Amino acid sequence: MKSIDEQSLHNARRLFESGDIDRIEVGTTAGLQQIHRYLFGGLYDFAGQIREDNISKGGFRFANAMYLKEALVKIEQMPERTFEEIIAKYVEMNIAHPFLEGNGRSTRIWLDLVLKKNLKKVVNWQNVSKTLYLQAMERSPVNDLELRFLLKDNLTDDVDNREIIFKGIEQSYYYEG
């Protein structure tokens, strides 16, 4: 019935406006799980839980549930020093796609926290087109060029600006709905 979407959008806003965003562990699996549990707790059965089922989209099969926990252990260890390293890490985290649903919205928040910690920048998502973003994400396992081009064009160092945060959350929620 998906007023689940309306409620989780309210949770995403509450995340920033309470300052709880500042309590989330950055660039780790556990931190991703914190985000997901915050956005979807009480809405999805599985909120914050690593899936035990397999999933694909388009022609892509995400990491097999049978070794997804082992994958995530390696992924969270990845360096975050450069824009390229951070995008490579986001890309592997997306290939893992650790939840049944809500991977995209939770992992974008997770990405911005990593960019903010390490580069003092976040993506100005409001200027990132849905078509170009989805195309880039779908290509990224083979070549993250499209994704690096697109996101690098759209970084901002105004990391706490209300308009960037809230128009960004709206755009993020639009990407998958």
Side-chain angles (χ1 to χ4, degrees):
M1 73 142 56
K2 52 233 269 61
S3 95
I4 293 169
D5 271 17
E6 220 186 333
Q7 292 187 61
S8 76
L9 183 62
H10 298 25
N11 294 159
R13 301 204 262 239
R14 194 184 70 244
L15 223 195
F16 289 82
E17 90 204 354
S18 58
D20 287 347
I21 185 76
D22 298 319
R23 246 92 62 195
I24 301 282
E25 185 178 82
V26 182
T28 64
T29 300
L32 188 45
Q33 291 181 93
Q34 285 175 313
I35 291 148
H36 193 267
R37 174 182 295 127
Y38 206 103
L39 303 189
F40 304 113
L43 304 175
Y44 291 153
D45 282 3
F46 50 95
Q49 312 180 345
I50 309 313
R51 59 177 166 87
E52 298 275 347
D53 303 308
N54 284 136
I55 51 174
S56 70
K57 299 294 145 43
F60 200 70
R61 228 277 309 276
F62 301 105
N64 195 124
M66 93 187 326
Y67 52 77
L68 160 66
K69 290 178 228 283
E70 297 69 17
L72 293 166
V73 158
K74 296 289 193 278
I75 295 163
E76 65 172 353
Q77 273 159 46
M78 291 176 83
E80 304 163 0
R81 289 172 271 110
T82 165
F83 175 76
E84 289 69 26
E85 280 175 0
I86 291 166
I87 298 310
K89 189 176 188 170
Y90 176 52
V91 163
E92 300 304 318
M93 193 47 103
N94 181 61
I95 288 166
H97 231 67
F99 313 106
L100 288 174
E101 308 190 59
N103 291 282
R105 291 149 178 186
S106 67
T107 319
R108 283 184 293 279
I109 292 173
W110 183 84
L111 169 61
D112 276 341
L113 284 176
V114 178
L115 295 166
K116 198 214 304 184
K117 181 194 200 174
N118 294 279
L119 304 175
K120 272 83 96 56
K121 295 182 197 296
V122 297
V123 183
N124 202 349
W125 293 106
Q126 75 187 302
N127 296 320
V128 175
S129 93
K130 186 182 182 168
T131 300
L132 293 177
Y133 175 74
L134 295 179
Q135 277 177 17
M137 292 303 289
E138 292 159 6
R139 183 60 158 166
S140 63
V142 167
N143 192 336
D144 67 8
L145 176 57
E146 286 177 19
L147 187 65
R148 293 187 287 107
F149 192 82
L150 171 70
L151 297 191
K152 181 142 211 62
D153 266 326
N154 285 283
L155 299 173
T156 174
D157 40 67
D158 201 356
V159 294
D160 295 326
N161 182 269
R162 64 150 161 96
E163 189 77 338
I164 290 163
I165 287 158
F166 297 107
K167 295 286 178 290
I169 288 167
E170 282 176 27
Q171 186 73 346
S172 180
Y173 269 67
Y174 170 62
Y175 291 155
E176 283 103 34

